[PDB]
Design a protein around this ligand. Structure first.
Ligand SMILES: [Cu+2]
Ligand SMILES: [Cu+2]
Length: 174
């Protein structure tokens, strides 16, 4: 169980510790650490249209997708660091990050077609137990600007599951 608090994830910003910068999030507000679903996105895992909720019904408020809906973290293109708060540590296969395609539609549901098919950042943890706070250093793909959604995936090595964290960003050109 864990969540990304820098850049603050969509679920994190729903929470009290995110100071409710997103509202009307349902139960997400009270357990942003709990977006657990089958590993293996995009070949498996949460179905299209339910990626942000990790396919969990009572987190479905996160599946709304409009330009106006979500608070966006401002970031500059290039190097980026993601920080996870690991409330319950589990042996870890990897940390990986996907981003929406150039030309995705911010007013349509998040789907595999809306995301690049492969991650832009991948850190192999070789099934080791992580510390309680984890930082992954990454680099954004070239040519990115504007509103984009980043999907953070924390894949658990000793279960069938992973934790899914979408992040809303406004990217300024490098
Ligand atoms: Cu857990
Ligand atoms: Cu419920």
């Amino acid at each position: 169980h864990g969540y990304i608090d820098s850049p603050g994830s969509r679920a994190f910003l729903c929470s009290a510790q995110g100071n409710e910068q997103n509202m009307d999030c349902g139960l997400v507000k009270y357990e942003p650490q709990s977006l657990e679903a089958k590993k293996g996105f995009p070949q498996a895992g949460p179905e299209d249209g339910h990626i942000a909720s990790a396919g969990i019904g009572h987190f479905g408020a996160l599946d709304a997708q409009t330009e106006d809906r979500w608070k966006k973290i401002p970031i500059t293109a290039g190097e980026i660091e993601f920080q996870w708060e690991i409330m319950i540590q589990h042996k870890t296969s990897s940390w990986e990050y996907f981003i929406t395609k150039l030309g995705w539609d911010p007013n349509k549901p998040l789907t595999r077609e809306q995301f690049n098919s492969t991650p832009f950042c991948f850190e192999d943890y070789q099934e080791k137990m992580p510390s309680s706070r984890v930082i992954n250093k990454c680099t954004l793909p070239e040519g990115y600007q504007g509103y984009h959604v980043i999907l953070g995936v924390w894949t658990i090595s000793d279960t069938l599951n992973a934790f899914y964290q979408v992040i809303d960003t406004t990217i300024s050109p490098a």
